[PDB]
Amino acid sequence: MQIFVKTLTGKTITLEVEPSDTIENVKAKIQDKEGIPPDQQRLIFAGKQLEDGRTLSDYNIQKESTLHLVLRLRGX
Amino acid sequence: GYNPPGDGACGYRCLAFMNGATVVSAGCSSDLWCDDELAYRVFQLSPTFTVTIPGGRVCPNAKYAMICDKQHWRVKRAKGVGLCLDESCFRGICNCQRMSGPPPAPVSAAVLDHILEAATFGNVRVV
Numbered sequence: 628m629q630i631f632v633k634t635l636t637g638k639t640i641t642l643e644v645e646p647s648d649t650i651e652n653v654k655a656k657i658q659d660k661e662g663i664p665p666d667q668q669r670l671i672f673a674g675k676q677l678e679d680g681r682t683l684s685d686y687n688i689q690k691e692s693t694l695h696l697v698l699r700l701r702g703x
Numbered sequence: 704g705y706n707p708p709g710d711g712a713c714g715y716r717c718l719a720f721m722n723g724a725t726v727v728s729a730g731c732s733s734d735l736w737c738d739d740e741l742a743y744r745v746f747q748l749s750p751t752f753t754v755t756i757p758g759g760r761v762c763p764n765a766k767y768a769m770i771c772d773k774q775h776w777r778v779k780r781a782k783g784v785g786l787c788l789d790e791s792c793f794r795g796i797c798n799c800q801r802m803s804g805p806p807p808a809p810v811s812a813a814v815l816d817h818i819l820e821a822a823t824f825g826n827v828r829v830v
């Protein structure tokens with residue numbers, strides 16, 4: 628199924644996922660497309676930061692859901 | 704805005720700038736660099752800015768954008784009064800409309816000093 632990830636610049640990324648995908652795997656899919664290391668990524672859905680070992684289904688993230696990608700930043 | 708020198712305390716210099724203060728650093732290693740978590744602690748006491756990257760969205764009610772560009776922090780003045788609400792505003796993903804309101808109170812120099820001193824194990828202090 629597809630989900631969408633909205634980045635800080637307003638770009639929308641489309642990911643191919645399954646409900647059993649872990650947040651860690653989703654972050655690796657985002658790295659594939661945007662080049663951001665997973666350890667820098669904070670994924671937000673329903674106002675909550677998603678934890679790495681959980682699955683999309685654990686958060687009831689269904690087809691055509693949109694997540695926000697925010698970033699850890701340091702500097703110077 | 705404000706573009707700090709490139710010394711290790713650069714992000715702390717930005718936080719101070721947005722609160723009408725300056726800092727002195729005895730040296731700030733990369734493990735002690737200002738990060739988004741520390742910036743959020745300061746935001747919670749005077750919620751006037753969004754932390755983001757170049758081209759990133761700023762809360763419409765932010766007075767400043769604190770921008771991390773290739774591991775260098777700087778501050779740009781934004782178009783709001785400094786009336787941000789919560790962490791969604793801090794990250795630039797809120798649904799705010801620009802509002803008018805009274806100018807925001809900065810974090811006091813002493814309160815900011817304690818946060819910076821603790822975060823940098825004494826190496827960065829407010830002047």
Ligand SMILES: [Zn+2]
Binds near residue numbers: 762
């Ligand atoms: Zn906002």
